[PDB]
Amino acid sequence: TLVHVASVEKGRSYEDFQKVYNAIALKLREDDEYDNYIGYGPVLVRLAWHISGTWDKHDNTGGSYGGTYRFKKEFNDPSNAGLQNGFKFLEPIHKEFPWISSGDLFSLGGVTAVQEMQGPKIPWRCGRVDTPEDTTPDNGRLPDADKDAGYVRTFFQRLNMNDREVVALMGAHALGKTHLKNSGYEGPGGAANNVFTNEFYLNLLNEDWKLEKNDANNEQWDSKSGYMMLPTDYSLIQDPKYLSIVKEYANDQDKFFKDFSKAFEKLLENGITFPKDAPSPFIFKTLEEQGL
Ligand code: HEM
Ligand SMILES: Nc1ccnc(N)n1
């Protein structure tokens, strides 16, 4: 009974949004020291996921539309610890382009980051509209990491995501790292953690994983190379259906890129109704493609 209709920021077109993307991308290129020289790319993708992943398909609460992560209940969710760095990064961009909605900015940061980390193009649509403080979802809607594949499958069905979508989306765990102070997990998933590749899947299959307890007394899978997987990550090689898809993405980066692009756009758009005459989705040029 609750419907969020996309409403284009008044008088804006593709070219305006490309300007915002460019701002984000130039700042990503500039702020390269963050997190031991990873850069802000990974935290921006986690932000776009965590603002979208509060969605509940059953009643259309949560989701990216309302830009509710600007409110303290959501900003202070334990599940979002560390994401304040991404929000602060986006602050000067919102000042430069005050006409953009919060949901549009947060979601566009994620798209920007994937594309500037040499990932696939991710079509993106404008029209999210800030909603009031009382529409902010309660904490507890983002997933736990200390679970098995059954949990992961059930959790993601709330986001209308199926097996292929869940395994595709998880390959964003090639990016960045876990930080003990944020989540009670520590270490990167791979060597190339600010370039978007199929490394997550290759590492799951090819590394020699040992189950260990970390300094916060949580179990994680640790490799002789100094990489980690969360229990939920490692579950993708435990469940038969997931392991098939992991092997597929390990064998074929082009396919992973295609499936990730679709899944991530779907995630970022869950809960939004695009009127049949809205603009077609935007595909933004990278800085490289523009000579910038
Ligand atoms: C079962 C579902 C998931 C669980 C339990 C999970 C859990 C986690 C945890 C615990 C971290 C570490 C946070 C920190 O300590 O800073 C992390 C990081 C990350 N997550 Fe996920 N995640 C899930 C799905 C996803 C999805 C769907 C995406 C995006 C498509 C994503 C993108 C990332 C990124 C890019 C990072 C690295 C952030 C950084 O380096 O600052 N995650 N995730
Ligand atoms: N960087 C990350 C984030 C989450 N999971 C793994 N294995 N690596």
Give the CA-based shape. Answer: globular
DSSP strand tally = 7
- Helicity level, as a percent range? 40-55%
Number of domains: 2
What is the strand arrangement across the widest sheet?
4-5-6
CATH class of the largest domain: Mainly Alpha
Main sheet summary: 3 strands, antiparallel
Ligands in the model, by name, code or SMILES, are:
protoporphyrin IX containing FE, pyrimidine-2,4-diamine
CATH topology of the largest domain: Peroxidase, domain 1
- Beta-strand content: 5-15%
CATH architecture of the largest domain: Orthogonal Bundle
N-to-C SSE string, H for helix and E for strand: EHHHHHHHHEHEHEEEHHHEH
Q: What distance separates the N and C termini?
A: 45 Å
Give me the number of helical elements: 14
- Calculate Rg over CA atoms: 18 Å
The helix-and-strand class reads mainly alpha
PDB class: oxidoreductase
Keywords: engineered ligand binding site, Oxidoreductase
Assembly: monomeric
Entry title: Cytochrome c peroxidase (CCP) in complex with 2,4-diaminopyrimidine
Report on the structure:
One of its GO terms (biological process) is hydrogen peroxide catabolic process. This is Cytochrome c peroxidase, mitochondrial. Its EC number is 1.11.1.5. This protein has 2 domains: 171 residues, Orthogonal Bundle (Peroxidase, domain 1); 121 residues, Peroxidase, domain 2 (Orthogonal Bundle). The chain starts with a strand and ends with a helix. It has 292 residues and is mainly α. The longest helix is centred in the N-terminal third of the chain and has 17 residues. The chain is built from 14 helices and 7 strands. Bound molecules: protoporphyrin IX containing FE (HEM) and pyrimidine-2,4-diamine (LG3).
